Chains A and B, each alone.
Chain A
Amino acid sequence: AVPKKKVSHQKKRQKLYGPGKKQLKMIHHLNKCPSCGHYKRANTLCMYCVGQISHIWKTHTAKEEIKPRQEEELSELDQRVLYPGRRDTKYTKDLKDKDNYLERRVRTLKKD
């Protein structure tokens, strides 16, 4: 149930790193994407090219934003009177800074 001794430096290290099962393997199965000449996984789509195509689809197949007439044709002063500004909470501010906590996809290296 309980360790009888302080496990030594040797014995913890040979346990962890000695076996190949536990080690990380080289990703030999990279290959060139045909659409953009960059690294991608074998039997896998290029995340750049498919992303680009998805973006294209979004730009074309776009549901139009609903802008109400009455709010679109308000005067500036009138709009200010109706819908004044406010102090956002700390939480709200944190939520707003998305680049702080949201990871954008990195581009791979160009294949040789």
Chain B
Amino acid sequence: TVGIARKLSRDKAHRDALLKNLACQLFQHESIVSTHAKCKEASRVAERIITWTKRAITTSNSVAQAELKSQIQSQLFLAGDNRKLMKRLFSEIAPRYLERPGGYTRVLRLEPRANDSAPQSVLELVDSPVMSESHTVNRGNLKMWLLVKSVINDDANQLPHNPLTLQNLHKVAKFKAEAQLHGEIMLIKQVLLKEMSLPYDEALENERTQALLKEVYSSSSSYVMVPRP
């Protein structure tokens, strides 16, 4: 009751409802901006919900599965824009995370908001699909977009990629088919380059992407450690 969670200056009933709302909004819009503390708590709920959904999907035990389903239902507000949220959770969202052991969200810190000095953050779903089956781009996966923008900038400058950038790319890849990842990167480039107004010679960009993928995939002192005399 003290120390188990953030209180967030709200009465228990209100607080829980707020958290549910945040979770629903995260599932609907695959990224959302909010205050840092709220985001942190919301992540805990959303992740829990995702795991329960995964458990329901997997389990052979029928009773268990039913219980998981009931728990998931309890943890959401299913109305208006979130009428078919349960369906989405089972069919669209939870199947992304079957291999991933936890860590389905990422809270990314922003510069604190000016009017309030409140620490601001971006709660968002990990490995959200950047491109739907229709020829559009999807709202979400901000980190990936940022990475690709950084890559583009490095290419423009004719500089080597930073170790941190490479590490991030590797992390992104870990639960991604290589060809799919490449195609996503290419798609992101097309939009990003146009926005920034750099020229998109396609074959060269593809080659660069391929090169970036290759280095990611193929893995390759002051004090001396000496035994006791």
A50-B122, A50-B146, A56-B191 given; A36·B153 CB < 8 A: yes
B149 touches A49 (CB 8 A): yes
The number of residue pairs between A and B whose CB atoms lie closer than 8 Å in the complex comes to 60
Is A103's CB under 8 angstroms from B153's CB?
no
Report the minimum CB–CB distance from B40 to chain A (whole Å).
15
- The answer to the question of A14 belonging to the interface, with a C-beta cut-off of 8 Å to chain B, is no
Among A35, A41, A44, A55, contact of B149 (Cβ-Cβ < 8 Å): A35
Using a CB-CB cutoff of 8 Å, which residues 36-62 of chain A contact chain B?
Answer: 36-37, 40-41, 43-47, 49-50, 52-53, 55-57, 60-61
Q: Is the beta-carbon distance between B137 and A44 smaller than 8 angstroms?
A: no
Do A60 and B153 have beta carbons less than 8 Å apart?
no
- Knowing A45-B109, A50-B122, A61-B137, the reply to whether A34 touches B195 (Cβ < 8 A) is no
B145 touches A44 (CB 8 A): no
Instruction: Report whether B146 and A103 are in contact in the complex, using a CB–CB cutoff of 8 Å.
Output: no
Closest to B192 in A: A56
A43 touches B109 (CB 8 A): yes
CB neighbours of B110 from chain A (8 A): 44-45, 47, 50
| Interface size, chain A (Cβ < 8 Å) | 21
Do A53 and B142 touch across chains, with their CB atoms under 8 A apart?
yes
Q: Which chain B residues border A47 with CB–CB below 8 Å?
A: 110-111
Chain B nearest CB: distance from A62 CB in Å? 10
Number of interface residues of B (CB under 8 A): 24
B168: min CB distance to chain A, Å:
9
Contact of A56 among B114, B137, B157 (CB under 8 A): B137
> Distance in Å from the Cβ of A37 to the closest Cβ of chain B?
7
Q: Per a CB cutoff under 8 Å, which of A40, A41, A52, A57 touches B137? A: A57
Q: Give chain B residues whose Cβ lies under 8 Å from the Cβ of A41.
A: 111
In the bound complex, what is the Cα–Cα distance between A45 and B147 (angstroms)? Answer: 11
Task: Report yes or no: A49 in contact with B137, Cβ–Cβ below 8 A.
Answer: no
**Given A61-B138, A61-B139, A103-B114, residue A45 in contact with residue B191 (CB < 8 A):** no
Cβ-closest chain A residue relative to B33: A54
Tell me, yes or no, whether B74 is within 8 Å of chain A by CB: no
Cβ–Cβ contact B162 & A60, under 8 A: no
Closest 9 CB pairs of A and B: A34-B150, A35-B149, A61-B139, A60-B137, A57-B139, A35-B150, A53-B145, A47-B111, A44-B109
Given contacts A35-B146, A45-B122, 7 further A-B contacts (CB under 8 A): A34-B146, A36-B149, A47-B110, A50-B142, A56-B191, A57-B139, A60-B139
Chain A residues within CB distance 8 Å of chain B: 34-37, 40-41, 43-47, 49-50, 52-53, 55-57, 60-61, 103
